[PDB]
């Protein structure tokens, strides 16, 4: 199974992710994670993406399209695999388009601006792997710590008011219009389109995500 989840900064589309990493089996390729850990990691791509990140903006297509087909060359993508925040631009879904890589669902998470910036306020994240917690809506066991190494939990750089502004600028810019273009591709059944209420909580959001995929 292939599917991308579109949606805005804070959505809720890693934690999402996870549930169908999870249940289906495929790996969730969020460029995001990627970029930080090329951060994390000090390759070259973290040195070119670091400051590119921080102010808000998005990094290069090129860069991206190349981080992408590389990771889904590996073996844990043979059999499918979940991209989050990936597409984020009309070039780069005319990139994989013209890759041959078609998707068997598109899934919108449609959030108002006005939920995006108080959630994320709340955003936790076990820095290392990734992995999001919310102080409120979907809090870890033990406050402050990870669920799975008890590592103290961190907020992530970009995520203060002024920079989570700029993303949502961004995103109504040059990732909104995906919308339409996946909707293109679904009318030519070319992959399955649906979209979800995002406001609601975490688990009637992975319940409505299960009725979709089965
Ligand atoms: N259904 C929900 N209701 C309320 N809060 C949620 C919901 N889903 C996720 N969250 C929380 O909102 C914040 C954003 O979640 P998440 O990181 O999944 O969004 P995202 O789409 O990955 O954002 P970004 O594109 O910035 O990574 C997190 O702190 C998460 O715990
Ligand atoms: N597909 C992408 N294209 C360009 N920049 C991206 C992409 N995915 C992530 N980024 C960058 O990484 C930042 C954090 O991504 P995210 O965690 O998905 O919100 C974005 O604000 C961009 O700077
Ligand atoms: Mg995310």
């Given amino acids: 199974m ?3 989840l579109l949606g805005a900064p804070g959505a809720g589309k890693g934690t999402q992710a996870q549930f169908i990493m999870e249940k289906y ?10 970029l930080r850990a090329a951060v994390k990691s000090g390759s070259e791509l973290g040195k070119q993406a670091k400051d590119i990140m921080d102010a808000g903006k998005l990094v290069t297509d090129e860069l991206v399209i190349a981080l992408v087909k590389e990771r ?6 043979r059999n499918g695999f979940l991209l989050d925040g990936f597409p984020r631009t009309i070039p780069q879904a005319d990139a994989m ?3 041959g890589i078609n998707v068997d669902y598109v899934l919108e ?10 959630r994320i306020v709340g955003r936790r994240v076990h820095a290392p792997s990734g992995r999001v917690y919310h102080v409120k809506f979907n809090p870890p066991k033990v406050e402050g710590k990870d669920d799975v190494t008890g590592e103290e939990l961190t907020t992530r750089k970009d995520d203060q008011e002024e920079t989570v502004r700029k993303r949502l600028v961004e995103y109504h810019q040059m990732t909104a219009p995906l919308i339409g273009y996946y909707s293109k591709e679904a009318e030519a059944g070319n992959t399955k389109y649906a979209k979800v209420d995002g406001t609601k909580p975490v688990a009637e959001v992975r319940a409505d995500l299960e009725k979709i995929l089965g």
């Fill in 2 to 4: 292939r599917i991308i």
């Fill in 25 to 34: 089996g495929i790996p969730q390729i969020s460029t995001g994670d990627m």
């Fill in 109 to 118: 998470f449609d959030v108002p601006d006005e939920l995006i910036v108080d």
């Fill in 97 to 99: 388009k013209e890759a």
């Fill in 72 to 77: 889904i060359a590996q073996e844990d993508c």
